[PDB]
Design a protein around this ligand. Structure first.
Ligand SMILES: C[n+]1cccc(CNC(=O)[C@@H]2CCCN2C(=O)[C@H](N)Cc2ccccc2)c1
Ligand SMILES: *[C@@H]1O[C@H](CO)[C@@H](O)[C@H](O)[C@H]1NC(C)=O
Ligand code: NA
Ligand code: NA
Lengths: 28, 251, 11
């Protein structure tokens, strides 16, 4: 899908979930 | 999921529950990859050592769920299976090599705030993100401990482990179609998938395009959350040629 | 244990 992987309640609204930053910080 | 936490509402809208019709019970996790296709572990459908060999009519998939046991009226959607496809070289005899299966739904599911597909990785995204130390996220309604069950979907973030460490942790033969994840004993943090989480997704959020990709499928482990052991995941990208072939042929 | 699901899905 063109829209795959973008969550309606998070990415689509520019809201972050409580732990996704932990993932980003690991991508060094 | 051991040592995880309750998911937030809509945190994993691609999460799918594989549900046995009779008796009514959870069979496995799975993931939504389009309006008509669900991805899971082959061992969720076929595992002769445990007399497991499900046919389409044995099963339902429940999409959009949060609560494990409730019927989530007006939120979840329940779909029947048109056809199951298991990887032709799935190795149930030895080590679960190529532990992957697809399920086509009888009718497309409607997307909503709670139901939305995850991306499958391309070669570049896989090469970029499948690196030791990089963390992914595993979700499921499986056991909270090795030896009970959660009220709602559980989530845990876990780092990918160096291949030699994966290999040295087990007597089972590891292949390029698997990777392992979890913390080392010296790392102080914990967490793992467990029985019941089988077939669920290991996902990573690309920092390049801010989309979630499914890199792994919960496949196997020796115990749950044991020190010095790791969870093993089907390497989705390595098997993507098969995925595409099935979808192209039967879509 | 599991809440019963609508009959329509078991037919
Ligand atoms: C992280 N994790 C921990 C425990 C169980 C699981 C879910 N997979 C399973 O329970 C699978 C299904 C068949 C036996 N499984 C196992 O995980 C076995 N415990 C180990 C095994 C590996 C490979 C071949 C045979 C046996 C995942
Ligand atoms: C599993 O089920 C199918 C169909 O019912 C059957 O043909 C097959 O021999 C069984 N065992 C397998 C695939 O190992
Ligand atoms: Na070994
Ligand atoms: Na461990």
């Amino acid at each position: 899908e063109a829209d795959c992987g973008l969550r309606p309640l998070f990415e689509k609204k520019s809201l972050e979930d409580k732990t996704e930053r932990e993932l980003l910080e690991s991508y060094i | 999921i051991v040592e995880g936490s309750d998911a937030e509402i809509g945190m994993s809208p691609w999460q799918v529950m594989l549900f046995r019709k009779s008796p009514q019970e959870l069979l496995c996790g799975a993931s939504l990859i389009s309006d008509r296709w669900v991805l899971t572990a082959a061992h969720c459908l076929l595992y002769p050592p445990w007399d497991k060999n499900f046919t389409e009519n044995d099963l339902l998939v429940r999409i959009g769920k949060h609560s494990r046991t409730r019927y989530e009226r007006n939120i979840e959607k329940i779909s029947m299976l048109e056809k199951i496809y298991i990887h032709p070289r799935y190795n149930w005899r030895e080590n679960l090599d190529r532990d992957i299966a697809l399920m086509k739904l009888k009718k497309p599911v409607a997307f909503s705030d709670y139901i939305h597909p995850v991306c499958l990785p391309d070669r570049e995204t896989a090469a970029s993100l499948l690196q030791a130390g990089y963390k992914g996220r595993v979700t499921g309604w499986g056991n909270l401990k090795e030896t009970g069950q959660p009220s709602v979907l559980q989530v845990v973030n876990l780092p990918i482990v160096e291949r030699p460490v994966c290999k040295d942790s087990t007597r089972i033969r590891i292949t390029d179609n698997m990777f392992c994840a979890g913390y080392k004993p010296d790392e102080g943090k914990r967490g793992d998938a467990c029985e019941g989480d089988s077939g669920g997704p290991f996902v990573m959020k690309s920092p390049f395009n801010n989309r979630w990709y499914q890199m792994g499928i919960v496949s196997w482990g020796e115990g749950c959350d044991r020190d010095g052991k790791y969870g093993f995941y089907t390497h989705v990208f390595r098997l993507k040629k098969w995925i595409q072939k099935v979808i192209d042929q039967f879509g | 244990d599991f809440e019963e699901i609508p009959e329509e899905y078991l037919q």
